[PDB]
Amino acid sequence: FMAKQYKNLVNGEWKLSENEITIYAPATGEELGSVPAMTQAEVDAVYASAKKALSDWRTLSYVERAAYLHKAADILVRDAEKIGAILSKEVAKGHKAAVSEVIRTAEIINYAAEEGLRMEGEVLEGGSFEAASKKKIAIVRREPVGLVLAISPFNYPVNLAGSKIAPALIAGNVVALKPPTQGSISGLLLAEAFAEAGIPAGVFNTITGRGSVIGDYIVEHEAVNFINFTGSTPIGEGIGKLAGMRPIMLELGGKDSAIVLEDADLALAAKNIVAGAFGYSGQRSTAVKRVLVMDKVADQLAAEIKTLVEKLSVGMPEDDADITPLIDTSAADFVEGLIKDATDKGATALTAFNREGNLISPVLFDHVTTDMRLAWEEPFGPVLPIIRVTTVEEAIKISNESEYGLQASIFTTNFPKAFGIAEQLEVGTVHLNNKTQRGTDNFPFLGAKKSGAGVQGVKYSIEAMTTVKSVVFDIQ
Template identity: 55%
Template sequence: MSNNSYNFNDLMDKNENRQYIQITSPLDNSVIGKVPALNQEEVDRAIQSAKAAFPSWRNVPLNERAEILYKAANILLEHIDRLTELLVREVGKDRKSAGSEITRTADFIRFTADTAKSIHGESIQGDTFSGFNKEKFAVVTREPVGVVLAISPFNYPINLATSKIAPALIAGNTVIFKPATTGSLCGIELVNIFKAAGLPEGVLNIITGNGSEIGDYVVTHPDINFINFTGSTEVGIGISEKAHMVPLLMELGGKDAAIVLKDADLAFAAKNIIAGAFSYSGQRCTAVKRILVVNEVADLLISHLKEEIQKLQVGNPLEKQVDIVPLINTKAADYVWDLIEDAKAKGAQLIYGGEREGNLIYPTLFDYVTTDMRVAWEEPFGPVLPILRVNSIDEAVDLANQSEYGLQSSVFTENLHDAFHVASRLEVGTVQVNNKTERGPDHFPFLGVKKSGIGTQGIRYSIEAMTRVKATVINLSH
């Protein structure tokens, strides 16, 4: 094997001298697979392979790169049943959501290829700036940045990996892909699908391993030219502190608020809020994580919320179709439970839930949550939803903006003027009017401000982020 050769599947072979990481299901703690814990030398080899493949890949015609992506989307759908089952077992997702993740990902890949074909450069005449003439003009093109490091989270191990990989590849970059440990089996399947679609060797390399061994090493590697990360704010801040002079695209934590005004359709708002807060047990960055409701309609809203929350199915997705599944691990469940206990101790009124069976926490709704309670500010990444009562629109906006996060917010109102007034003042990347907070459609811009992210994602925006502008100035007179 040469220094630039890297084949992850070779590393998957049983080796008595290699350390492996066992992947256990959050549903029953059964071991469902293992992945190699790579060392720094192997990471080096993966990166060098990607670096060596970059010059030829960037020169592959765009239509040929697009055809590989189209084929990958088709292969993904051909294996939807097997991948759905793997998603359920590896990250504890219900089957309906798992299947939707696969189909959405295939759509994402196709749209990425389509969009890249419509991104064009431009020419700029020199005489549009005073002191210059028509004999000087610039040809402006976009070029790939080089080797992209894509780091994906556990909760959407196929979709949020692809949202990084596909735009990077279509732009002519090569990719080092590090999935979350839980979710890495899905990540391996995804990489194999891209390779089966015709991706050349070295263009997409997956690495797995312990963060303590390879985490800091890979984000500070001198041959990484761009980092695209989705995960916690804590980890994101750490990456940004270490990755000197490397462009970043990050989707981090959130504390998305649903602001309910007095003229809102309360039954509609409640249905959206419960769906937005509790699907996949709230393990989503864009989950509704707090309700800010004008006091005069709070009681009526709560009655609708109780009606909706009681419809949620709780349990093991291996046994039936459910909405509330066990959390990804005990650490996550303990954290959510601590938030619930803190709210109880400080006087929050428990409206529904507040029960736990192992890592399964029942959907929990609190009223009269105050700003001294942790659940008012911290991101639970679990099925607990606090209600904070306010006396005015201004108070709701001010309270929403006090958060260190700024991913999304919802505003429910029948008054379009109030909707735009609130939207213009909220310090978030996206405001949803009369809808739950959510990601997508995937060609819309998706971004966070404050501690919720860096840069703008969304298919066109991601492609542009992972390219750089180059100007070639033509001087006709000399």
């Protein structure tokens, strides 16, 4: 393996900056490469190119824009192993899961291309509202918003770059992608696929750099017409106060509850809970982060979950381990603190805590109470609390007391009751007898409270990054 010096895509050209940021693999410390450390003047060059490209891009037919997206997705499928191998090292994601992330990104790009090209407008009748305006009709068609700034997260630096880029591009918007620093190589590899597909100069560009130099600058810039961001809740809250009146989409944290009723299939509930809670070592916003279980089935459910947590593989990304090293030392320190607080307050550790560097073994706690930090705080690590409840009303109350409202799971055999519970839960999506998940990517993805703003899922993302233009006239 030889570390490479990567370049940003700026107005159809690949550009270095005077300074750069060296990226290391979180699992091994191996140097992977460097990405440019852009200056504010270089961000200005990116946005000037994007605004100059907008007129010719938005005036192309939908089929012409869709052709570029399909070509980019075919190139990603062609290079999925080459890109997935680097994505795996960059964010300590299992090799197979990293290659699957690249394939999922090609699927979302293809799906957005076809969803976006068949968007329709509407014709409204004046006579629906008043008799005197019966000959007046409004011809309402969709239009792009302009320049979209897409900011991807470290945990899905390609998938949640494509989930923003393709819906924005099909609608006729121009895009600047700002990947996270830990994930910027993978983001620039995605950019190479769009460049090789022949995306016109300035239509798609990348920005890489340090938060202290360009962090607020890329968002506050008046060239930006829309900010689409996935990342931490505190950073998300900052973007909301910098966007001003400009539309935004935020995908932030979660503390998804899994409510287990007395009539649940406990073995199946345990399977779905462990798959959801410990995927990518719990470093997912949509992940079962707390089990709210009825007292009478709690001992048997905990035994079923424990059996499965003990069998999860813990190790290196190259080995496709279920639990891989966390993204950085600060993240593992934070998770260890939550583990220590639950232990010191009397929670039962059903599986042992171990920390090898930043590789934390999966910890399952029973008898977790609302005074413990782990009942509320999003860990972004492999630790799952089980909180016992006496009534369904109590589970709803504890679930809704969270500042997060991304998704919830309900495990029961009474679906009419599960729907009644789902109506009361302050979340975007409720999965019945299955783990929480963003997929399938055509379904809406949204969070209530501090989990975000806006509705994603492919068609919803296109609708968010478009506006309408109405032309009104009188028939004679």
